[PDB]
């Protein structure tokens, strides 16, 4: 696992000044394959037009010549970089598939393989930190492997290293959710990781310190983070809205354990409780099936808000009595 290296900067490219021919784009050039003749003909026509203009044609010819000699190598370097990037992507996908097949089909004990597990975690930590919001293709292969790994889980020293990385891994997830990076598929995996972390790891002085510091990370982002999660719900995707809805349950649940709560208050300001009660209408149409499990998390969340004293104020003002009557479920 030494082929993932960003020091070479295969994505970054030094762009020369290009005082001339700057407007000549690679439109007709483009399977990423930029043809060189499509730009050669254009620059030749432009040189001919400039020569016909009769304005310092002999002197400025060498400038156009060297600009073309630089543009051809620029195109070749871009093609080589694209090839290297796709090759690295294929290799990373193959390695991730191999690691998944190895972890899944493994009857051997886990306490001896804990060393290799920690080594893989240490190796992927910098990979995730370097590609947290750069590209949405490599994180996918590396995001799902961490998901299953978290569910398939001297002892004191190991317990500290695990909990330490699980806390660091929790930060990069909320950081991506606050910026709405990647596709809804990748954004869904992050919800499952943070879900079990806030449900199993945190849930006794050691527990208080972890719970206290955990809430600090959530408060750092504020409404910016919750706004993204609230938008994912009742969306186009079927699995993203489900994971996002269940995620909110863990946030409000762990917050009460820490008579009021800032998480529930933010949901009201973002108009989340309002639209949520509105969706209660026509619930009979929505209700193993993906639609059934989604509604379960929906009604389950509302049940939690009705347990705190402050929830009755915001929930009652939503006029939920008239919303459940139009559906005729009773």
């Amino acid at each position: 696992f030494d082929f993932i290296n960003t020091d070479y900067k295969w994505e970054e490219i030094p762009s020369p000044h290009f005082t001339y021919l700057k407007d000549l784009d690679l439109g007709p050039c483009i399977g990423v394959h930029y043809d060189i003749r499509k730009a050669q003909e254009i620059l030749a026509l432009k040189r001919k037009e400039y020569e016909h203009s009769q304005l310092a044609t002999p002197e400025f010819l060498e400038t156009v010549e060297l600009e073309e000699k630089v543009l051809i190598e620029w195109l070749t370097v871009r093609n080589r970089a694209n090839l290297l990037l796709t090759a690295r992507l294929n290799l990373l996908q193959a390695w991730a598939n191999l690691l998944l097949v190895m972890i899944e089909s493994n009857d051997f004990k886990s306490t001896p393989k804990m060393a290799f597990l920690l080594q893989a975690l240490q190796a992927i930590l910098p990979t995730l930190e370097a590609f947290s919001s750069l590209k949405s293709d490599e994180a996918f292969e590396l995001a799902r492997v961490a998901k299953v790994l978290l569910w398939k889980l001297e002892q004191f020293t190991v317990g500290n290293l695990i909990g330490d990385k699980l806390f660091q891994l929790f930060q990069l997830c909320l950081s991506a959710i606050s910026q709405c990076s990647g596709t809804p598929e990748l954004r869904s995996l992050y919800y499952s990781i943070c879900y079990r972390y806030l449900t199993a790891v945190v849930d006794t002085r050691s527990v208080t310190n972890a719970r206290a510091r955990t809430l600090k990370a959530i408060t750092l982002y504020g409404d910016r983070l919750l706004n993204v999660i609230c938008d994912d719900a009742y969306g186009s995707d079927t699995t993203c809205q489900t994971a996002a809805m269940i995620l909110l349950n863990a946030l409000v649940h762990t917050s009460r354990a820490s008579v009021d709560c800032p998480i529930i208050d933010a949901l009201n300001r973002l108009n989340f409780i309002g639209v949520l009660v509105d969706s209660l209408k026509e619930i009979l149409n929505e209700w193993a099936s993906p639609s059934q499990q989604y509604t379960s998390a929906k009604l389950a969340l509302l049940l939690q808000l009705c347990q705190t004293r402050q929830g009755a104020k915001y929930v009652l003002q939503a006029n939920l009595f008239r919303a459940l009557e139009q559906s005729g479920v009773f």
Binding site: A44, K46, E49, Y50, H52, T57, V64
Partner: protein, 620 residues
């Protein structure tokens, strides 16, 4: 359009023998000429083409628009990464529409500030209003409804309306806040001007006009009931939704609740103020009847309808109709009807009129209208572009280019050629021909200008053009710089004559490094050889080598031969003899003159010298 040729000296008077007037269009738009072939009519009248823009502001405008055109890339075209190409296409195009709008606003500004004539400012603003409306209706929602993007839409709409006309101008705010014959602020005027403000989305000002007179006064005292209405109404105004079509759904709720509550309650105020408060609440609630009642112009109605009743363009057809039933289109200004047309679906047939207001704007307008796909080339057929064969937009753009070529501003020539080159239609060869004919007229002065011309001749492969341009440049130092076949030969001959008569250029042929690099032809080589020979001369065997070189040069080539003979005489083995012999074998007025100058008969002297040389060879 009738313009006075010269609002000073008019060359005619009575029908007194209708005189032969003659006119010739010049290579420069701003410099044409008229004259008369008649007795006692010997004046020349320089005329510039009616309504021509020579201003710097204009060229700035043009450059900005060309930038927008160029930057549009592949998106300046419309394809009649699957479902997104459509949405993203509209995204960028719609943005370009905003850019154009901006550039035009800036232009209009700079015209109001630096100006002799402000008529141009007015026309440009009108063009802007109509364009704002066009964007608001086709360049934001991409065929969808306001829910698709409530924020952007209402922003553009509210913008369009409050830039079309000036009213309510603050010169009218104080107009009523001054007029009396009534108790404080409570006549049809205050309210009309409050409702007007609301209908135009000008909520800030609206609020201000209230906290101006009887918010707390007459109300907080007289009727505590209506005070609460007039107050939390101003609160709702303070929070009119502009991002969520949900928040609006609930907003109109609180507003209709307020209007019902007040609707049937404690009337502890004047008979008129009662209704005067109800109407305000109705208008805010969206009562159609009322929105029409307090509207001065159709666009106030239309705007109100969209803001407070139902925010759906599916009703625009109806809205406009009601609006026009209330207030007819005001033919005072040129923008209202076009806006009505936009709103009501018939976008087209505006290009000719805009072309009358300003050729440039019209050109790019047609262009972006083609980009959106609002107009397309129906033609389906003659080896060239400037026709109806291609688009209506292509046509207008190409036309603009050609018009720019006669403007004589070298800053815009790149815009002209670029416009032609990027024309989404027409063979590369057709464009080649067009550029081949335009370029020679480029008003080059600098070195850079010329280099630009050349670069375009290269880029398009116009060697015959470049050759011509250069020919124009060629027409002692200039000759040196130039160093077609005949001319080169003449240059060679001149160099030879100079050598026979006998600095940096000569050394280069044989700052300095740059020159050597640039240099890096037969005439040149010969001159270099002559120079080397002279150098050798200045420096016995060397002298012989130089003489041999000279004889060789003479063989390759009358005056030169004479100079050589003179040199030989001044100097006065087998190879030398052979050379002398060849020269004798090879052996008019100018030559004789040169011979006379040298002496200060020739053939005889030459023969004598040859004989002497032969004798010398024999002795050796």
């Amino acid at each position: 359009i009738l313009v006075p040729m010269t609002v000073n000296d008019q060359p005619i008077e009575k029908n007194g023998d209708k005189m032969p007037l003659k006119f010739k269009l010049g290579p420069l738009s701003y410099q044409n000429m008229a004259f008369i072939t008649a007795k006692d009519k010997y004046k020349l009248y320089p005329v510039r083409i009616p309504r021509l823009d020579t201003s710097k502001e204009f060229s700035a405008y043009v450059s900005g628009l060309f930038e927008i055109y160029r930057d549009l890339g592949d998106d300046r075209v419309f394809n009649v990464v699957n479902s997104n190409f459509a949405k993203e296409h509209n995204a960028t195009v719609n943005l370009a529409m905003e850019a154009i709008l901006n550039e035009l606003e800036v232009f209009i500004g700079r015209v109001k500030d630096q100006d002799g004539r402000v008529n141009r400012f007015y026309e440009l603003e009108e063009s802007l209003t109509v364009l704002n409306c066009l964007r608001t209706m086709y360049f934001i929602l991409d065929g969808q409804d306001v829910e698709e993007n409530r924020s952007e839409f209402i922003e553009s709409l509210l913008n369009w309306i409050n830039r079309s006309d000036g009213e309510p101008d603050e010169e009218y705010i104080e107009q009523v806040f001054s007029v009396a014959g009534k108790k404080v602020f409570e006549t049809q005027y205050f309210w009309k001007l409050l409702n007007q403000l609301v209908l135009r989305g000008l909520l800030s000002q609206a609020i201000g006009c209230i906290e101006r007179s009887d918010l707390l006064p007459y109300l907080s005292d007289t009727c505590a009931v209506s005070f609460d209405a007039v107050s939390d109404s101003i609160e709702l105004l303070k929070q009119y939704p502009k991002d969520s079509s949900s928040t609006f759904r609930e907003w109109k709720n609180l507003v209709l609740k307020l209007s019902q509550a007040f609707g049937s309650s404690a009337t502890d105020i004047s008979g008129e103020l009662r209704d005067y408060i109800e109407d305000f609440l109705l208008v805010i609630g969206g009562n159609q009847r009322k929105i029409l009642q307090y509207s001065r112009t159709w666009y106030e109605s239309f705007c109100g309808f969209l803001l407070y009743y139902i925010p759906s363009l599916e009703l625009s057809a109806e809205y406009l109709q009601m609006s026009l039933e209330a207030n007819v289109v005001d033919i005072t200004n040129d923008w209202e009807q076009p806006c009505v047309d936009i709103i009501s679906g018939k976008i087209h047939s505006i290009l000719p009129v805009m072309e009358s207001l300003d050729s440039c704007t019209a050109a790019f307008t047609a262009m972006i209208c083609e980009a959106k796909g609002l107009i397309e080339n129906i033609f389906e057929g003659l080896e060239d572009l400037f026709s109806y064969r291609n688009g209506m937009a292509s046509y207008m753009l190409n036309s603009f280019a050609f018009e720019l070529c006669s403007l004589g501003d070298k800053e815009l020539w790149p815009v002209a050629i670029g416009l032609i080159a990027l024309s989404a239609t027409g063979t590369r060869s057709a464009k080649k021909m067009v550029i081949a004919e335009l370029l020679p007229h480029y008003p080059f002065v600098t070195n850079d200008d010329i280099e630009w011309m050349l670069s375009i001749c290269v880029e398009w492969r116009l060697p015959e053009i470049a050759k011509e341009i250069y020919t124009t440049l060629g027409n002692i130092e200039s000759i040196a710089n130039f160093s077609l076949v005949k001319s080169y030969s003449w240059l060679l001959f001149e160099a030879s004559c100079m050598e026979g008569q006998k600095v940096l250029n000569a050394i280069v042929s044989k700052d300095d490094v740059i020159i050597p690099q640039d240099i890096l032809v037969t005439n040149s080589m010969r001159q270099t050889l002559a120079p080397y020979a002279v150098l050798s001369q200045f420096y016995d065997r060397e002298d012989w080598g130089q003489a041999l070189r000279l004889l060789l040069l003479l063989i390759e080539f009358h005056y030169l031969v004479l100079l050589v003979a003179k040199f030989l005489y001044p100097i006065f083995e087998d190879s030398v003899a052979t050379v002398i012999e060849v020269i004798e074998t090879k052996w008019s007025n100018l030559y004789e003159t040169i011979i006379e100058a040298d002496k200060s008969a020739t053939l005889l002297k030459n023969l004598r010298k040859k004989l002497n040389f032969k004798l010398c060879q024999a002795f050796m």
